[PDB]
Amino acid sequence: TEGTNEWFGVDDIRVLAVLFIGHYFILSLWLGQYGNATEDDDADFFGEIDYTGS
Amino acid sequence: DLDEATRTVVTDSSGNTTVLTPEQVKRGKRLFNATCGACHTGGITKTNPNVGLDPEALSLATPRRDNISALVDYLKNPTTYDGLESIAEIHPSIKSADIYPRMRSLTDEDLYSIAGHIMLQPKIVAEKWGGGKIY
Amino acid sequence: RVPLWLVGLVGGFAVITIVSLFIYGSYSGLGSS
Amino acid sequence: AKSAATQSRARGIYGQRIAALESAVNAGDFGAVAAEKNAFILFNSGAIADKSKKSEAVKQTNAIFAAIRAKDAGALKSAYATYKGANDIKVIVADKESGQGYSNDYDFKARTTLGTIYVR
Amino acid sequence: AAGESPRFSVFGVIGDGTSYSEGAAYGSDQSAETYSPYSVYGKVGSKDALFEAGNAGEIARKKGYIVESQKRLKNLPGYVEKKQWFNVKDELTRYMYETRGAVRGLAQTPEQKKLAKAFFQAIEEASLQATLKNGDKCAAASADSIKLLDQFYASL
Amino acid sequence: VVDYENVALLGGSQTVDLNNANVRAYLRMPGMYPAAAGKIVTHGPYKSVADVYNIPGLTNAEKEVIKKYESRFTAKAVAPEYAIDRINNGLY
Amino acid sequence: RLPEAYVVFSPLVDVFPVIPVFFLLLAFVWQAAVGFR
Amino acid sequence: IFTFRWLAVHGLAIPTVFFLGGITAMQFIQR
Amino acid sequence: MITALTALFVLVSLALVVTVPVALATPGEWETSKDQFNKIFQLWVGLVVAIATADGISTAI
Amino acid sequence: MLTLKILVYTTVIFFVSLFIFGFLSSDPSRNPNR
Amino acid sequence: ERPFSDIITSVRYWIIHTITIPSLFVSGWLFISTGLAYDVFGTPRPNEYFTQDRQQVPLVNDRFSAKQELEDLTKG
Amino acid sequence: MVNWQVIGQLVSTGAIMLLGPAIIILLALKKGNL
Amino acid sequence: IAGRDIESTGFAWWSGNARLINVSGKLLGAHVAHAGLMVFWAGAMILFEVSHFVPEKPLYEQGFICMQHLATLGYGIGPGGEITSTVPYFAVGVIHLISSAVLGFGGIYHSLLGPDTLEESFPFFGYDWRDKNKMTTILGIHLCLLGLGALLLVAKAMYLGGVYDTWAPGGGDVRYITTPTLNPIVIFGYVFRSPFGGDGWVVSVNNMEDLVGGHIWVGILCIVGGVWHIFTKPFSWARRAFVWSGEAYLSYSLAAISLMGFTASLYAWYNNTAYPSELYGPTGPEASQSQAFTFLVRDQRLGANVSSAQGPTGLGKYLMRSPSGEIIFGGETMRFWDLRAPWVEPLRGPNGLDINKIKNDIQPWQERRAAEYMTHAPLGSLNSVGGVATEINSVNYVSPRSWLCCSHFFLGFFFLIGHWWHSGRARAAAAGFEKGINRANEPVLSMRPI
Ligand code: CLA
Ligand code: CLA
Ligand SMILES: CC1=C(/C=C/C(C)=C/C=C/C(C)=C/C=C/C=C(C)/C=C/C=C(C)/C=C/C2=C(C)CCCC2(C)C)C(C)(C)CCC1
Ligand SMILES: CC1=C(/C=C/C(C)=C/C=C/C(C)=C/C=C/C=C(C)/C=C/C=C(C)/C=C/C2=C(C)CCCC2(C)C)C(C)(C)CCC1
Ligand SMILES: CC1=C(/C=C/C(C)=C/C=C\C(C)=C\C=C\C=C(C)\C=C\C=C(C)\C=C\C2=C(C)CCCC2(C)C)C(C)(C)CCC1
Q1: Which of M17, M26, M38, M413 to mutate to test the pocket of ligand 1 (most atoms within 8 A of CB)?
Q2: DSSP M343
Q3: Alpha-carbon distance E123 to E146, whole Å?
Q4: Sign of the dihedral defined by the CA atoms of residues M383, M384, M390, M394, in that order
Q5: Does J15 sit in the ligand 4 pocket, CB within 6 Å?
Q6: CB M79 within 8 A of CB E104
Q7: Nearest to residue M355, comparing CAs of M316, M324, M323, M313?
Q8: Angstrom distance (rounded) from CA E83 to CA M357
Q9: Pocket residue to mutate for ligand 4, from M202, M205, M223, most atoms within 8 A of Cβ
Q10: What SS3 state is found at J32?
């Protein structure tokens, strides 16, 4: 309704489904570019802006 | 100037008058503005506009409250407009000072000064004591 | 022969005193309800 | 700006002042009568909107004061009576049932016998 | 008229002092004592104060409060039986708002203090179990509260 | 309506209409405002001034206080636009 | 009121809260002392 | 003495001090 | 009595407030004067403790 | 009226996700001093 | 010449100012205190707004007879 | 009835105000790290 | 002197505190000195408020803002919200005032005499604004401290005396919160709900159990996050998104503090559980509802049947229905039908106000509360007149709620301006063109015509 206290206004399954689909679609598009990042201690830098390619 | 002719007010029902000292005026104004002013500012009643503090309303009350003694008695024992029922539990008074903590440090001189201020205001402002927002 | 950082202090003191006197008078005397 | 309100104000104030002199002139108070020369002049100047009437009023006032400067208790009374008759001056007191002389301040009837106020 | 110097009063120490408008007086313009320089009233317990402390009227008012509070407390079991929790929560706060004041005003001896504390804890538990919708605990707490208030009034 | 004939009986004169006047009209008769006027202004139409004594529940005191001022009362036809506001008409 | 023993000090308590403004002004005074380096 | 600058500054600073003294005197008048 | 103790505390605090920054700012003064400052700090703490103890004794029943 | 809610939610989440993941794509390095 | 930064330092300036300024300040204080301003400018005193006879606001009501009207309103 | 409150307030505020320029001037005289 | 003039640093005198960016010894002293100033103000203000106390008036008629927090924590308050003693306030003030001296001495020492940079003699307390590990370590440490503080508040609520509960069963009084709520759905539904009318976001907390449970969850989360940020290093997706410099961190903090200031101001304006109304006065809606209640009671006592009365518009003079069905008060106060107050709940049923209770079960104390709250509404002027804007000078009253709301709202907006300015400058300086455009290699001149 109006004055109820649902999380993010979700009162039906379809709303949650479409929210998930949106975040995940854009996330997959972003992953297609940034999905090969590693945490090894040679990808770091010493500066104010990350110019180390990708 | 505030002469003695303008400081003469009626004290009892017979009609005898008195002269208020210049210090009593200041004390009465201070105590009234401190204690009454939230609800009785300008001589009106905010929570019941049918019962004002102008002299005409005080005169058409049952125990007649247009003098110092009646005002002091009302402050010690409030009643309704016809004087039939006691309203001490919904109005500040000495009798119900255990409910209202702002009346626990009042002496007889304080009540006398407050009543004097109420009686004196109409002679000074005139038709603006209890008149409302029109004036 | 006073350096130009003490005379300004005296002027500021005088201005502050004058302003405080007028803001107090707002609060007492004529024109104070 | 001269208008009817100016005449009303001047007529009220100065006619009341002049009519207050009836008891004084009945017996004779030459000094007290001459004490209202300013009131007479003001009533003549600002309470009559007519050239001929103004001239007649000035003539009557001059006659009144000329009789005053003669220790003449009879001519003074006659001139005062004819001035009152000509200019229609009388003492007026109002009530509250048919009243409302004034409502606010700034009025020339605020604390006078003409001032009555009805508060609902 | 023709010439008159206006009245002067410097901070209330150099001048008249009482001119219907002084400010910063802190007393010193009246023949009476005040609670403090920042106060207008006098001391509460002074010799000329019209209000006593603990007179007959106060005691009568508190005892009437306690008696009517007992009478009101005798309704809760029916509400719990009918499962009307809002009635249980409203009864403990509609008339019984002054019960704490009366009880704390009429308690002097330590055993009275212990009884008062136990009664307050019992009614708090009753309200909590009413808002949690548990019938058995609410009924037990109501019975305990009734017994405790009866004991406290008896000890008076 | 533009023209109302009995406008003087609403509290602006010495006579009060029992069927249309507000409760404030009784404030100028001492000893009557908070008790008897409230009963008068909350009961049905009166065909006469004598009908006010038949109100179910009138104690004696109200009866004689009404008898004292009976000479100031009258009962006219009921105007629905005035009779509906007899406790609170928006005037303060 | 303060407790009965410390009532004599109330003039000082009336002026205590305004000190940080004095600190802010003292910063400017210090800067003016060195002639705005 | 008779230079333009002296006559200016003065003819706008003397009444200022006079008026300031007047206002300071006004601040203590009682009703 | 604690009024005199509080007055002494106020005076000592005023002296410390006036003195300490001057010693800190001037080069070398804090190095040499670092034996009596300890005494003043000890007096400060002792006055605090004495005031607290006396007030607690006076007000506790 | 539920279908309108679904469509509006889809549009809003699409644009908000575009914003969020756009600012995460090494934005500080997109300056003329690279 | 000699800009202001030199005047604000010369001691003769200081002595002449310390002898001149307080005279003017005290003159203003005495002008207010003695009640002369009320006479010069006609401002009513705090107890002259209403006289014993006149209890209303005294508005001027004539153009060419303003002198007599103001004389009557003032005291007469 | 002599109103010690106002005198106390004025003296206290005067001393508090004077406390600061005093230390600044003392440092200036003693040639500190101003 | 080197490092303290425009010649050696730039940064003219009106921007002098910007010369401490790369001087890690004096910056510590400066921050410590500001902390000492804060503590000093707290102590001085509470002592000043204690000195001016009078027992006749309530706290909201004396212009106090600090005593109410201590009263809410449960110090010197009695049943119904009456002050019985002021000694604990005096003790708190004395303790704060004494601690301020130690803080100030530490600040002035670390600022004037201590080493200029700590990176050469105390490696533990040293950083570079660019070593991400050290910054995360510092953040985690001070975060763990915050979590400990929240747990301390919980411990005070549950064991060390209790807090003042205004919804207490039998009149507001101090009590122990024995069963705080821990179900995560309730707390995070407070967090994740809408901010609009009826919801209220986090402002709408309406009982003490939820408050205690929330501060418990906050403490746990803060401890866990502090340890995690201590023992880890920023990941890849965070490294390429942020700017790593001191000014950037300052801007990051400025934005959050502005948001918190806005939230606190709206707490002060709307909430009445953590801000009980007997200490701060009535809220906005509460005063209008009190006026409606007062005149309903008066008209009903005169003999009226207050359920069938018709207003000028034909809508209902005293009672009507909300757009969802609940029975509410009539008049212009139909907008404030979301109000819930301890003096009006005893008359509410499962579907709004109860007619049967209203007709013959209204107590005199509710009448007294409504009469008091109607004439102390949060309205006033700058010179503290009180009342509507067309009132005359008789009363001297402005509510503390208005002061708090206005002041902290003003501060929040200006700190948002801080986010904008300091963040823009930080990024421009990091890129390397904060001093102007280069004449020889102007970027625009090498772009295709438009
Ligand atoms: C935690 C808060 C915080 C911190 C640590 C800083 C820190 C800094 N800021 Mg920043 N800033 C902030 C908040 C903050 N800012 C906010 C909220 C704003 C928005 C208004 C700004 C706007 C701002 C600007 C526009 C600038 C800075 C600059 C600076 C740098 C030098 C500042 C300096 O020397 O001050 C010197 C301090 C003064 C000269 C004092 C000025 C006095 C103020 C204006 C009085 C304010 C009125 C006061 C409230 C009431 C007066 C009462 C009086 C009558 C007694 C420094 C890195 C400057 C810089 O160089 O950046 C690199 C710069 O240009 N900041
Ligand atoms: C919260 C306010 C605050 C704080 C903590 C600081 C702190 C600092 N500023 Mg700063 N500043 C401020 C406000 C502040 N400023 C404002 C508002 C302005 C604008 C006018 C400036 C303008 C400014 C400039 C232009 C410079 C600083 C510099 C400095 C640093 C060295 C100062 C120095 O050499 O002292 C020298 C000063 C003195 C020796 C005189 C002060 C003596 C003491 C400290 C006065 C206080 C004593 C106290 C009352 C007694 C308490 C004692 C205790 C035991 C109780 C220091 C970290 C300098 C810097 O960057 O250094 C690297 C610098 O060049 N500031
Ligand atoms: C660095 C710097 C700065 C800063 C500074 C600071 C910030 C400082 C601080 C300071 C401080 C922060 C201080 C404090 C102090 C304190 C004290 C000193 C206290 C004392 C106390 C006392 C003395 C008390 C007493 C008492 C008692 C005990 C009881 C009651 C009564 C009384 C209250 C009296 C400046 C900016 C200027 C400048 C630059 C540099
Ligand atoms: C205590 C308490 C409580 C609470 C609790 C809680 C649990 C809280 C929480 C809270 C929270 C949990 C919060 C959070 C927040 C978050 C945030 C605030 C975020 C933000 C974000 C950001 C800021 C980002 C940004 C960005 C983007 C988006 C893009 C890219 C870039 C960046 C990254 C920058 C309660 C009410 C219950 C009750 C009372 C008590
Ligand atoms: C707590 C205490 C105390 C106190 C302490 C303190 C902490 C104080 C200090 C501080 C202070 C309190 C300081 C002050 C100072 C300030 C001043 C006095 C300032 C002034 C200013 C001015 C006047 C400025 C001006 C100017 C210039 C010069 C130039 C530029 C412009 C200007 C205009 C800004 C004592 C000892 C009693 C002891 C007891 C406790």
Answers
A1: M17
A2: T
A3: 9
A4: negative
A5: no
A6: yes
A7: M316
A8: 19
A9: M202
A10: coil
With an 8 Å Cβ cutoff, the interface of chain K facing chain D consists of 55-57, 59, 61-65, 68-69, 71-72, 76
Q: Please, are residues M429 and A47 in contact by the beta-carbon 8 Å criterion?
A: no
Q: Is the CB of G13 under 6 A from ligand 5?
A: no
How far apart are the C-alpha atoms of B50 and F22, rounded to whole Å?
A: 12
Amino acid (one-letter) located at M95 = I
E strand spans, chain F? 16-17, 73-74
Q: Going by DSSP bridges, is the β-strand pair E9-10/B17-19 parallel, antiparallel, or unpaired?
A: unpaired
Burial of I43 (0-12, 13-18, 19+ CB in 10 A): middle
Q: I55: CA distance to ligand 1 center in Å?
A: 44
C-alpha to C-alpha distance for E85 and E138, rounded to whole angstroms: 10
Quick one: DSSP state of residue E20? S
- Chain B positions touching E20 (Cβ under 8 A) are 2, 22, 25-26
Q: Name every protein residue with a CB atom under 6 angstroms from any ligand 2 atom.
A: G 27-28, 30-31; I 17, 20-21, 25; L 33-34; M 3-4, 13, 16-17, 19-20, 23, 26, 29-30, 33-34, 101, 104-105, 108, 111-112
CB contact under 8 A, C21 and H24: yes
Total Cβ atoms within 10 A of residue M99: 15
Are F and H close enough to touch, i.e. 3+ CB pairs under 8 angstroms? no
- Report how far apart, in Å, the C-alpha atoms of M173 and of each of E62, E94, E101, M82 are: 18, 16, 10, 10
Give resolution, Å, one decimal: 2.7
Write down the experimental method used for this entry.
cryo-EM
Residue nearest to atom 2 of ligand 3 (CA): M108
**Nearest-5° Cα angle at E47, E45 to E50:** 75
- Cα–Cα dist D104/M146, whole Å: 65
Q: ∠ CA F43-F47-F49 to the nearest 5 degrees?
A: 80
| Residue G18 structure tokens | 């305004």
CB-CB contact of E143 with E135 (8 Å): no
> What residues form DSSP beta bridges with M319?
M329
Q: Which of M23, M29, M231 is nearest to M141 (CA)?
A: M231
Contact M304, M107 (CB under 8 A): no
What does B91-128 look like in DSSP terms, one character per residue?
S--STTTTT-GGGTT--HHHHHHHHHHHHHHHHHT-S-
The distance of M265 to chain B (nearest Cα, Å) reads: 27
DSSP E strands, B39-93: none
Contact E126, M169 (CB under 8 A): yes
Q: Give the closest residue to B111 by CA, choosing from B12, B31, B10, B6.
A: B31
Atom of ligand 3 nearest to the CA of M111: 1
The encoded tokens of residue M242 equal 């942020």
- Site from J8, J14, J15, J23 to mutate, A interface, most A CB atoms within 10 angstroms: J14
CA distance I43 to I9: 9
Cα distances (Å, whole numbers) of residue M127 to E30, M110, M233, M297: 67, 17, 15, 69
